[PDB]
Design a protein around this ligand. Structure first.
Ligand SMILES: CC(C)OP(=O)(O)O[C@@H]1[C@@H](O)[C@@H](O)CO[C@H]1O
Length: 490
């Protein structure tokens, strides 16, 4: 077997699966760990976008009532160190101690904010575990299939603690941990004791190449088998090589810009709305995305299933209203900083360049401020910044409620004073089953989100990868890389 060489845009701060939730972490943690339920993106000849949920660590499951799901676990599944996976490891993964409890905030900072209203799991036997919520939740199944639910070994994790575990991870996944050199690489090796489809690569290296041009030239040399986070502008050149090709897809993620609402200038919605209303998304999608990216009609995505609104109108573009809103606001022409980690996000810097020009035209002077990976400045030194949200549920709950909800980081850390109505509907949607009331509540939340502008949705990026033709791997409609039955050589 060949050793897989990946030229990536970035690396996560940790390999602890919840702390690895980013654009850069899932592509690694998906190799080290498994979930109870997994998604088959390639079901029924789909091009890496199938919504099909299949058994993984749980061979079967059954919803008992409105707040509990019993899982029958796959037997004799071994962790990388030889310890057998039991219901105890599953219970610990979803425990108050490790995940959603008050003390857990020091280990997994976003654990509670991203979790459901969990109640302590129930271990029925060695291979039977019931996951439960304190209040009704029809989201247990989707949460279990998500990036929040990768199963950790209880004894090893507790022995090391969350911080040391994130630097020496042990999972059940197809690839085991070899090395993690921060700001350089993550090396993994084949787990030949894997319960599922056998690893096809002997080794996997995720090498940071922050500059996309250095990344492209890296594949042409070729120092890499696959390179990530490209732009549709890189397409024609890579494809001009007979042994190289681009591989891309629209992913279940949106790019955005957001605000530090603790800053005087961003406390009121006026300037935030003015900046939102001047964003010309169709020109950005032509100039930088060559029609490949997509513009959602608000905080509304097809993956939401029953909570997606297909009748919803597009987000407003109104330069004249934006101009008036700048005039009415307290803003005085003082340069506003916009923080970006270079091109961590595809087209981050070219996108900002276009917006600075759009904003200059409405009377807002915006300045780019670059920061190195891991060198993000203190919160009060930042005003505007770019971000992305992976839509991780087959439901509208994620990410409006975990990110923008009353217990979320946009309101708590970033100072968004959300209207009472918004927070009230967030509570109803978490608890209500699907229906007219729930559908309408999500639509009213979407209306408040656009009126308030705590963040401004830009587009669903078209995720562009490039690879050696002799490396057979197909992208998935999510911000991760899948190698299970989706990696071979020659
Ligand atoms: C830099 C990082 C933490 O942000 P990123 O856009 O890579 O990851 C987000 C994550 O913060 C969370 O909002 C869920 O979606 C991810 O894309």
């Amino acid at each position: 077997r060949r050793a897989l060489r990946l030229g990536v845009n970035g690396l996560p701060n940790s390999l602890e699966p919840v702390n690895a939730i980013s654009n850069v972490g899932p592509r690694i943690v998906n190799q080290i760990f498994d979930t109870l339920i997994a998604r088959d993106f390639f079901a029924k000849g789909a091009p890496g976008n199938a919504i099909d949920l299949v058994p993984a660590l749980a061979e079967s499951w059954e919803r008992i009532d409105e707040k509990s799901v019993r899982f029958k676990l796959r037997q004799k599944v071994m962790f990388h160190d030889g310890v057998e996976l039991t219901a105890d490891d599953v219970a610990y993964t979803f425990s108050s101690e490790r995940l959603w409890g008050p003390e857990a905030i020091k280990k997994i900072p976003l654990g509670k904010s991203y979790s459901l209203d969990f109640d302590e799991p129930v271990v029925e036997d060695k291979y039977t575990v019931t996951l439960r919520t304190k209040t009704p939740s029809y989201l247990i199944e989707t949460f279990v299939a998500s990036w929040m639910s990768r199963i950790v070994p209880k004894e090893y994790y507790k022995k090391l603690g969350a911080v040391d575990f994130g630097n020496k991870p042990v999972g059940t996944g197809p690839y085991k941990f070899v090395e993690f050199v921060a700001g350089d690489r993550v090396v993994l090796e084949a787990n030949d004791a894997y319960w599922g489809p056998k690893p096809t690569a002997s080794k996997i290296t995720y090498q940071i190449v922050a500059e996309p041009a250095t990344r492209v030239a890296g594949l042409i040399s070729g120092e890499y088998d696959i390179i990530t986070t490209l732009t549709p502008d890189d397409i024609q050149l890579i494809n001009s090589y007979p042994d190289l090709e681009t591989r891309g897809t629209l992913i279940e993620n949106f790019h955005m810009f957001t605000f530090n609402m603790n800053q005087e200038v961003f406390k009121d919605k006026k300037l935030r709305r003015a900046l939102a209303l001047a964003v010309n998304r169709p020109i950005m999608v032509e100039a930088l995305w060559k029609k490949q990216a997509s513009i959602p009609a608000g905080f509304n995505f097809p993956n939401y299933g029953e909570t997606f609104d297909p009748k919803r109108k597009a987000m407003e573009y109104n330069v004249e209203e934006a101009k008036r809103l700048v005039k009415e606001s307290g803003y005085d022409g003082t340069p506003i900083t916009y923080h970006t980690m270079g091109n961590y996000y595809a087209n981050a810097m070219p996108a900002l360049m276009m917006m600075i020009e759009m904003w200059k035209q409405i009377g807002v002077n915006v300045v780019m401020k670059t920061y190195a990976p891991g060198s993000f400045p203190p919160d009060n030194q930042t005003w505007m910044r770019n971000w992305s949200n992976g839509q991780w549920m087959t439901d509208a709950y994620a990410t409006i409620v975990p990110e923008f909800g009353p217990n979320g980081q946009v309101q708590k850390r970033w100072g968004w004073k959300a209207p009472a109505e918004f927070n009230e509907l967030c509570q109803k949607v978490t608890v209500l089953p699907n229906g007219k009331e729930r559908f309408d509540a999500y639509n009213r939340m979407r209306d408040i989100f656009e009126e308030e502008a705590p963040a401004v949705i830009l587009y669903q990026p078209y995720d562009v990868y490039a690879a050696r033709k002799d490396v057979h791997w197909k992208p998935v409609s999510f911000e991760m890389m899948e190698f299970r039955n989706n990696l071979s050589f020659g």
